[PDB]
Amino acid sequence: IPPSLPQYDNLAGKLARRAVLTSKKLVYVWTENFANVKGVPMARSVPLGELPNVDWLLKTAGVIVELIVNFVASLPASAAAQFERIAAGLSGDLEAARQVHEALLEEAKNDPAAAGSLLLRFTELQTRVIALLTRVGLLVDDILKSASNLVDGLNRFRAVFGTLRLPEVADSFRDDEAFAYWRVAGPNPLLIRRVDALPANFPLGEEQFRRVMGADDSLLEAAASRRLYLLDYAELGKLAPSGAVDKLLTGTGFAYAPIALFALGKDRAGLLPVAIQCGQDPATHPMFVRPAESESDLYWGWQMAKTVVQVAEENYHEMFVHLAQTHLVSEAFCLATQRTLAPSHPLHVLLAPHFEGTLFINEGAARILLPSAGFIDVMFAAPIQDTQATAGGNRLGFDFYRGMLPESLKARNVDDPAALPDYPYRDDGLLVWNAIRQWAADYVAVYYASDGDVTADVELAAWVGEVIGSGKVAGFRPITGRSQLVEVLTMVIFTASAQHAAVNFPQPSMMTYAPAICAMSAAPAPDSPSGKSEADWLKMMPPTLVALEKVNIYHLLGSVYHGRLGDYRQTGFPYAPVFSDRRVTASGGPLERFQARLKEVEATIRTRNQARRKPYEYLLPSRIPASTNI
């Protein structure tokens, strides 16, 4: 049976669906008082049908067990003794669970007709792997309680990896061009903007600019030729505390809201860092200017200033770009969808796959990552109550329309490949955005023939109402026609899939090594550009506990690829197609066209990567999950 809009469904359909929605609303319940994320709309609890499937669980547990084994193996034999039996037991039990899963799958295959008799056993396996994860929880608590015993000046930052290979950034982090390239190809491709005139509170002058870029360049010429780009972290607010923040677990930490200027040379061959101010007030933050190789008295001040930017970057990236603007946005769309679009509504069928695992992973962020003494309280400088409030405020202020990729690119004046040629997030992102848009256009056209079909759809009206109201999605507005609906669906889908991928999957290769990036520093911003030493810079590096949590959490969160954009098949048993409607699934139809377009996009991106200075692979469709689930 094809899905239907409520105004067209037959009566038995209409009453069945309104009763289903009355039921859904008892199961999927809004709160703004979820523990550790006050003010953000959340599910009160995760319904049974929203727990992760076995396939996700085995993937996630697999990575976690690899990390446990790696940790235990890095310990001295004496310390390892406390944990070896437990670690061996987790490995063996996970393997046992894989085998149960594989047996169940082969049993279903031997008699597909009898496969419904297996569903309790499939949920029993889900329960079992979740219980395995509870045991992991207990082991993590124990490791952390014994952190003192277990846990060029940087050897401790290598040691925490065990036998995991250090990422490339461990080699290249001090390099100026590499630093600049984070701005366009790193986990946070969103903050960088063109600058036409400098902020008043960033008094970089003509003479300083020419010192760096050459006597034949100028601020005026560079600005006018679209060669100046600014990173300004003012929006971090309380994520950049004024001073020292003393915590029990990590001692004294600092973070920052700096401003940094980058420029292209006249040949536009690449972005170069020009100047950094380590906070918003120039009266208390001197100007650091890019030093020449011979200026050994400026060298370490400049390394310190870049580390200041990178501290700000982890705070901005993780709390805003990643948690607030992917995870916590998709939370709202998940809840509105289940509460207001009947399961037989075609938009429910389309969107549900894009929220698989979202409620679960988000409850995990709040319960595990955000309480006092949790990962974020360890890894991020600000008091945890300030972090929670600031991330939440950022989610609440995120404008849905202004946040769409093309609008973002335009508002920041970074949408012109002629002016800023090397911007992989922009160029690959647009390919994926546009492919999704055509799919959304095609799919909408199946079910909505007129703008009348959009305005007369009472479920869609209720959905918009809940997204605006209970969901507190800023900038969302009434949907009055088909083209608008398409732009909306494109954004909801892109957000859930590609955007999350682009800002989540860089975590292992770019964020696991604390000297290259960390959301806390152990020292104030450099007080002068001149006369700093390696020892002054080393003082900024975090306590080892920070590094230990960092390598493990960022490896995990970027190593689970579950589901794939466009596949539209269940990702757990029985792995059936999402769509039944032959208008969607037919040969040469909307779905096949979307699938084929994504492979075209993949081929284009691979071609682009052969010619890039470094490959950018996060927006390869083959590496984009349909949902935000890790």
Q: Which residues bind ligand ZPE (CB under 6 A)?
A: 60, 64, 67-68, 71, 133-134, 136-137, 140-141, 143, 318, 322-323, 327, 361, 364-365, 367-369, 375-376, 379, 548-549, 552-553, 556-557
Residue 134 interacts with, from Fe ion, ligand ZPE, none (CB under 5-8 Å by kind)? ligand ZPE
Smallest distance, Fe ion to C-beta of residue 509, A: 15
Smallest distance, ligand ZPE to C-beta of residue 136, A: 4
* 317 known member of a binding site: no
Alpha helical stretches, state H, 146-175: 147-150, 155-159, 169-172
Nearer to ligand ZPE, 9 or 549 (CB): 549
Q: Are 420 and 229 in contact (CB under 8 A)?
A: yes
Residue 466 interacts with, from Fe ion, ligand ZPE, none (CB under 5-8 Å by kind)? none
Nearer to ligand ZPE, 34 or 262 (CB): 34
Nearer to ligand ZPE, 143 or 304 (CB): 143
- 492: amino acid identity, one letter: V
Could you tell me whether strands 193-194 and 251-253 are parallel, antiparallel, or unpaired per DSSP bridges?
A: unpaired
Please write down the HEC assignment for all residues of 81-100.
HHHHHHHHHHHHHHHHHHHH
Question: Which contacts (CB < 8 Å, 24+ apart) does range 70-76 have?
Answer: 70/161, 70/162, 70/163, 70/164, 71/143, 71/162, 71/552, 73/162, 73/163, 74/159, 74/160, 74/161, 74/162, 74/163, 75/150
Q: What part of residues 504-523 is at the interface with Fe ion (CB under 5 A)?
A: 504
* 149 known member of a binding site: no
CB atoms within 10 A of CB 430: 18
Q: What part of residues 487-506 is at the interface with Fe ion (CB under 5 A)?
A: 504
Nearer to ligand ZPE, 488 or 630 (CB): 630
- 327: amino acid identity, one letter: H
* 504 known member of a binding site: yes
CA distance 288 to 305: 7
Residue with tokens 């277990």: 150
Q: Determine, following the binding rule CB under 5 A, whether residue 188 of this chain makes contact with Fe ion.
A: no
Residue 143 interacts with, from Fe ion, ligand ZPE, none (CB under 5-8 Å by kind)? ligand ZPE
Nearer to ligand ZPE, 271 or 361 (CB): 361
Smallest distance, ligand ZPE to C-beta of residue 483, A: 33
Nearer to Fe ion, 5 or 502 (CB): 502
* 500 known member of a binding site: yes
Smallest distance, Fe ion to C-beta of residue 559, A: 11
Residue 173 interacts with, from ligand ZPE, Fe ion, none (CB under 5-8 Å by kind)? none
CA distance 196 to 348: 44
Got the DSSP string for 423-460?
Answer: -HHHHHHHHHHHHHHHHHHHHHHHH-SSHHHHHT-HHH
CA distance 329 to 317: 15
CA distance 25 to 18: 11
Smallest distance, ligand ZPE to C-beta of residue 503, A: 10
Smallest distance, Fe ion to C-beta of residue 374, A: 16
Residue 457 interacts with, from ligand ZPE, Fe ion, none (CB under 5-8 Å by kind)? none
Residues 6+ apart with CB under 8 A from 100: 125, 128
* 354 known member of a binding site: no
- Closest residue to ligand ZPE, judged by C-beta, is 137
Nearer to ligand ZPE, 151 or 223 (CB): 151
Nearer to ligand ZPE, 68 or 347 (CB): 68
Sign of dihedral through CA atoms 108, 111, 112, 115? negative
Q: Are 436 and 498 in contact (CB under 8 A)?
A: yes
Residue 50 interacts with, from Fe ion, ligand ZPE, none (CB under 5-8 Å by kind)? none
Could you tell me whether strands 251-253 and 245-247 are parallel, antiparallel, or unpaired per DSSP bridges?
A: antiparallel
Residue with tokens 């859930």: 496
Residues that bind Fe ion (CB under 5 A): 504
Binding residues: 322, 327, 500, 504, 630
Residues of each annotated binding site for Fe cation: 322, 327, 500, 504, 630
